[PDB]
Structure 1
Amino acid sequence: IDTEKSQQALVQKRHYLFDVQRNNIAMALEVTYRERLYRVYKEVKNRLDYHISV
């Protein structure tokens, strides 16, 4: 009986795998978005700065 109740406890804990997967998808998309914004900002500022430096 104790073993079966413990098996039920693990089944209750199951959901963390899908929490992990959803966390990783959200975080990867956010990292990609912010890297893209930094890329566009850096290119624009870099060209303007080449002009100002010459």
Structure 2
Amino acid sequence: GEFADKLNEQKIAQLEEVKQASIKQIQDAIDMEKSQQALVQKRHYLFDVQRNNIAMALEVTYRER
């Protein structure tokens, strides 16, 4: 009788870790993708701020002259 219960509870326990892993991994495929998307567009802006800053600073300078 017990033969089943231990095995069964074993068998469930498994798919319980299986569903778990599975969520946790796909959440990670997810994070990775956000990391990427960010490094994409995202990062250029830093340099864009910088280039913009220059452009302005020359204009102000020209005008001031």
| TM-score with structure 2 setting the length | 0.63
Task: Provide the residue aligned with 2:32 in structure 1.
Answer: 21
Identity %, equivalent residues: 0
Q: How does 1:24-35 map to 2 (within 5 A)?
A: 24-35=35-46
Written as runs of structure 1 = structure 2, the 5 A alignment for 1:1-54 is: 1-13=11-23, 14-54=25-65
Shift in Å at residue 9 of structure 1? 0.8
Give distance in 2, aligned partners of 1:24 and 1:5: 30
Which ranges in structure 1 are unaligned for 5 or more consecutive residues? none
User: Which of the pair has more CA radius of gyration?
Assistant: 2
Q: 1:18-40 CA distances to partner (integer Å, 9 max, x unpaired)?
A: 21112112112222122222222
Q: Secondary structure at the match of 2:40?
A: helix
Gaps of 5+ in 2: 1-10
Cα RMSD (Å) of the superposition?
Answer: 1.6
Q: TM-score, with normalisation over the residues of structure 1?
A: 0.72
